Amino acid sequence: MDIVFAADDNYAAYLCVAAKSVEAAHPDTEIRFHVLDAGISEANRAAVAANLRGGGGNIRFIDVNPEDFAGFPLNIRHISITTYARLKLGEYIADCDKVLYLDIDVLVRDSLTPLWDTDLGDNWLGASIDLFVERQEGYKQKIGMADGEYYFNAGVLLINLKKWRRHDIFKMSSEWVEQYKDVMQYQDQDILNGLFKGGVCYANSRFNFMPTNYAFMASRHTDPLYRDRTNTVMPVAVSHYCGPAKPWHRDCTAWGAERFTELAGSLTTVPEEWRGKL
Ligand SMILES: O=c1ccn([C@@H]2O[C@H](COP(=O)(O)OP(=O)(O)O[C@H]3O[C@H](CO)[C@H](O)[C@H](O)[C@H]3F)[C@@H](O)[C@H]2O)c(=O)[nH]1
Ligand SMILES: OC[C@@H]1C[C@H](O)[C@@H](O)[C@H](O[C@H]2[C@H](O)[C@@H](O)[C@H](O)O[C@@H]2CO)O1
Ligand SMILES: [Mn+2]
Numbered sequence: 001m002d003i004v005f006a007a008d009d010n011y012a013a014y015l016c017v018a019a020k021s022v023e024a025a026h027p028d029t030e031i032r033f034h035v036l037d038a039g040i041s042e043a044n045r046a047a048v049a050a051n052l053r054g055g056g057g058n059i060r061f062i063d064v065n066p067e068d069f070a071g072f073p074l075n076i077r078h079i080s081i082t083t084y085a086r087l088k089l090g091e092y093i094a095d096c097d098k099v100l101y102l103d104i105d106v107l108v109r110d111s112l113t114p115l116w117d118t119d120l121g122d123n124w125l126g127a128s129i130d131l132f133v134e135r136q137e138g139y140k141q142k143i144g145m146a147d148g149e150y151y152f153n154a155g156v157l158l159i160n161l162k163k164w165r166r167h168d169i170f171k172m173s174s175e176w177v178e179q180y181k182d183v184m185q186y187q188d189q190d191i192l193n194g195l196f197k198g199g200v201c202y203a204n205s206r207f208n209f210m211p212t213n214y215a216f217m218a219s220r221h222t223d224p225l226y227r228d229r230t231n232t233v234m235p236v237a238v239s240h241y242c243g244p245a246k247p248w249h250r251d252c253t254a255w256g257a258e259r260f261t262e263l264a265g266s267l268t269t270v271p272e273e274w275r276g277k278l
Contacts, residue, residue: 001029001116004093004101004159006036006085008066012044013274014104014248016051017263023053024263025108025237033059034093038066038082043271050269062092068170072177073187078244084188086154087173090164097162102238103155105246107259110237115158115207124196126158128208129230132242133186134220135212142183143190149197150226154189155240156208158201169195205232210240214255248277 003022007015015035023031031053037045040061049056069084085092086101093099100116102108118126130153133139140151173191177184184190202225205213209232219227239256241247247260264270264278 001026001112002032002034002093002096002099004034004036004086004089004099005104006038006064006082006101007040007104008038008080008082009040009044010080011082011104012040012048013277014246015040016048016267017248017260017278018102018104018106018108019048019052019059020263020267021106021108021259022102022112025111026113029113031058034096034099035059035061036064036082036085036089036092037061038064038080038085043273047269047271047274051267064088064092071174073181073184075185076187078246079187086157087188087191088170089159090161090167090169093161097160099159099161101157101159103240103242105241106155107239107241107247107256107263108237109239109256109259110206110235112207112237115156115203115237118158118201118203120158120160120201122163122199123160123201124163124199125160125192126201126203127152127154128156128203128205129153129226130189130210130212131205131216131220131230132210132212139185143180143194145193145197147221148223150200150202150221150229151193152200152202153208153210153240153242154192155210155242156203156238157192158203202229204228205230206234206237208238208240209236210242211245211254 133151247257
């Protein structure tokens with residue numbers, strides 16, 4: 001399967017740990033990593049590659065110009081501009097009709113095959129519902145969404161890349177931002193929801209288990225489909241630490257955070273400069 005990550009130099013060490021969690025969870029599947037590289041040093045790219053399977057033979061770094069998204073809002077402090085690179089995925093990857101995009105702050109705990117094998121049809125992508133945003137009464141509607149269209153989290157996305165390449169996603173994004181820039185609160189995540197609403201395949205929350213999913217253990221909707229997708233079917237396949245509290249920081253009380261340090265300690269090569277953040 002083809003996995004996509006996006007990272008700047010600041011997140012190179014975390015990218016490595018996340019990538020290894022993917023390999024660990026798929027002992028008999030070829031994992032081809034495609035990294036949207038917003039400025040990772042040569043040393044950090046070699047370090048990341050050195051810690052992956054085959055010495056990093058299955059990882060390709062794709063240079064992206066962070067300035068491309070300079071005009072887009074950047075209000076969330078823990079997030080850098082690289083968070084918008086995913087919008088040009090159709091321009092960055094030519095060899096894949098389907099890719100599975102993951103944020104850096106994820107820890108894969110179970111096989112992603114069921115998600116990967118999902119047929120997207122003519123939908124733009126497959127994603128899990130964001131309970132945090134869905135319970136933010138009235139927000140969804142601020143960005144033009146209907147009550148029956150569920151707001152998804154942009155941290156785990158099965159992308160119908162073949163469909164994306166038939167359109168100019170960046171232009172559509174810039175136009176959407178121009179229309180909603182004064183109300184959007186979630187940056188790239190708002191854009192994706194706004195552009196693809198009505199053309200989203202919903203995956204079970206086991207593939208994007210965030211703090212709110214954990215706390216959830218009253219549904220915002222009675223819709224049986226909504227309930228089916230938001231009820232996580234155990235075991236958790238993907239832990240996603242969205243928000244300012246990350247597993248690589250101090251006193252992370254988020255569930256499953258200890259697997260991060262456990263993976264970091266299993267790293268083959270750890271540069272002196274990674275000792276701090278890991
Ligand atoms: O120093 C940084 C900070 C962020 N990033 C990138 O930006 C993504 C953006 O942020 P988080 O994963 O920390 O975002 P968060 O999960 O808290 O936020 C929700 O809203 C975000 C909005 O911009 C993203 O869409 C994200 O996918 C979604 F889950 C990271 O995965 C990473 O690829 C870097 O490369 N370096
Ligand atoms: O859609 C989730 C949303 C994305 C946003 O970018 C991120 O900063 C944010 O964090 C939440 C987190 O999901 C909650 O569990 C926590 O209680 O609050 C933070 C906001 O400070 O999540
Ligand atoms: Mn995230």
